[PDB]
Amino acid sequence: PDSWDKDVYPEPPRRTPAPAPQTSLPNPVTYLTKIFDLLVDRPVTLAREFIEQQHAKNRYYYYHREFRRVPDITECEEKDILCMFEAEMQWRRDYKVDQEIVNIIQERLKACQQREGESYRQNCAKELEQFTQVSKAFQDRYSDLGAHYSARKCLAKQKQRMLAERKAAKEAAA
Amino acid sequence: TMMSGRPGRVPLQFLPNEARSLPPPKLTDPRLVYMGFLGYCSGLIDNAIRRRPVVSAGLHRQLLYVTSFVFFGYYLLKRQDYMYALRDHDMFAYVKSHPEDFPEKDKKTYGEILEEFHPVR
Numbered sequence: 247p248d249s250w251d252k253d254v255y256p257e258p259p260r261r262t263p264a265p266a267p268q269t270s271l272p273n274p275v276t277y278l279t280k281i282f283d284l285l286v287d288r289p290v291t292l293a294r295e296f297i298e299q300q301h302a303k304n305r306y307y308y309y310h311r312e313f314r315r316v317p318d319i320t321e322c323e324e325k326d327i328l329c330m331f332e333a334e335m336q337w338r339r340d341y342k343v344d345q346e347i348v349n350i351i352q353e354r355l356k357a358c359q360q361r362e363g364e365s366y367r368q369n370c371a372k373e374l375e376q377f378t379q380v381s382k383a384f385q386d387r388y389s390d391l392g393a394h395y396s397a398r399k400c401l402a403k404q405k406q407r408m409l410a411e412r413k414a415a416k417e418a419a420a
Numbered sequence: 421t422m423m424s425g426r427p428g429r430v431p432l433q434f435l436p437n438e439a440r441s442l443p444p445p446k447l448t449d450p451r452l453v454y455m456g457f458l459g460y461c462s463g464l465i466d467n468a469i470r471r472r473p474v475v476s477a478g479l480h481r482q483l484l485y486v487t488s489f490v491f492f493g494y495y496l497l498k499r500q501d502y503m504y505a506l507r508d509h510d511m512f513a514y515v516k517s518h519p520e521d522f523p524e525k526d527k528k529t530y531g532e533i534l535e536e537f538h539p540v541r
């Protein structure tokens with residue numbers, strides 16, 4: 247369906263085997279499926295057709311808000327309240343977007359496990375690696391900021407991480 | 421006494437001539453309205469103490485209460501605003517005249533400032 251993006255939410259092609267009956271006995275599942283189609287599917291399809299006809303007469307649109315980029319807390323001067331405000335709001339929006347990214351990856355993982363069923367350990371290794379990488383990066387970014395997290399605290403954590411990486415590189419080169 | 425003995429201060433002068441250059445309080449000032457409210461409360465308490473009908477009796481007396489409170493409040497607000505303007509003027513002049521005491525400092529961005537990170541866990 248065009249409701250969502252297939253590239254963002256991938257689904258493997260569906261391979262349904264053709265029925266190969268070996269007995270003359272009638273299939274109760276087939277008979278009940280025919281009954282369900284006759285009694286339920288047709289009336290609900292007619293109702294949805296009427297509703298969609300009524301919708302098409304009043305077609306109106308809504309838009310997605312776009313935020314232009316602004317200088318971040320690194321560029322802001324010390325105790326420059328306006329630049330700090332803009333940078334903090336931008337960091338909070340980025341935090342929300344990153345959280346939704348992790349949510350999308352987790353949904354991929356869950357859906358793939360359920361779809362694979364009994365062979366999930368081998369067939370879901372591709373989605374497990376992506377989740378591992380994304381969770382690792384997200385944890386390193388926002389792991390222990392606290393209840394009163396802020397762009398300044400995230401920047402301080404990044405500075406500490408960069409100093410540690412530089413020290414490790416120097417020690418390895420020594 | 422901080423602003424007592426300030427040069428050029430005329431004694432026993434509620435409002436000097438140099439205060440005439442400031443914007444007078446608006447008559448609809450929230451502080452003036454609160455002074456009127458205090459006057460009305462005083463009138464109601466007067467009626468209650470003298471055992472007259474609190475909201476009905478003594479309308480002329482209540483009006484005088486409100487008017488007197490608003491009058492004194494207007495003059496008090498003028499004096500308060502003048503004194504605060506005087507304080508700001510003196511502070512700015514002193515900062516201007518003592519640059520070695522109030523030096524401009526180079527502003528370092530948070531990219532250059534190093535702050536310790538304390539994790540919450």
Ligand SMILES: CCCCCCCCCCCCCCCCCC(=O)OC[C@H](COP(=O)([O-])OCC(O)COP(=O)([O-])OC[C@@H](COC(=O)CCCCCCCCCCCCCCCCC)OC(=O)CCCCCCCCCCCCCCCCC)OC(=O)CCCCCCCCCCCCCCCCC
Pocket residue numbers: 460461464465468472473474475476
């Ligand atoms: C209204 C909200 C006020 C909020 C707070 C603001 C500050 C206070 C208000 C100013 C003072 C008001 C008058 C005080 C004395 C009242 C005496 C009395 O009986 O009053 C009944 C009186 C009517 O009765 P009446 O037929 O004349 O005479 C009955 C006898 O007095 C009957 O005599 P009785 O022998 O039966 O009296 C026995 C009674 C006598 O009891 C009293 O007299 C109690 C009231 C006076 C106590 C002290 C009042 C506050 C004085 C300042 C202290 C700080 C206040 C803020 C405190 C904050 C923290 C608590 O004693 C007891 O019940 C003893 C047991 C209780 C003792 C423990 C509780 C004590 C509470 C003290 C604090 C109360 C604060 C709130 C104010 C309550 C009264 C309004 O009603 C009023 O005075 C109502 C208030 C005025 C309404 C004006 C409405 C004007 C038109 C509409 C205007 C609309 C807004 C404007 C804009 C335009 C819009 C279109």
Ligand SMILES: CCCCCCCCCCCCCCCCC[C@@H](O)O[C@H](CO[C@H](O)CCCCCCCCCCCCCCC)COP(=O)(O)OCC[N+](C)(C)C
Pocket residue numbers: 424430431432433434435496
């Ligand atoms: C051409 C001639 C024109 C003459 C025009 C008249 C000029 C002014 C005349 C003043 C009246 C004549 C003298 C009578 C006594 C004067 C008292 C007053 O006017 O003096 C002022 C005094 O004003 C009062 O101090 C302010 C009164 C404030 C009342 C409220 C206090 C604030 C309380 C905070 C909560 C308020 C709640 C609401 C209150 C209603 C300043 O005098 P000052 O020489 O400098 O004081 C020296 C002492 N110091 C230095 C320690 C201060």
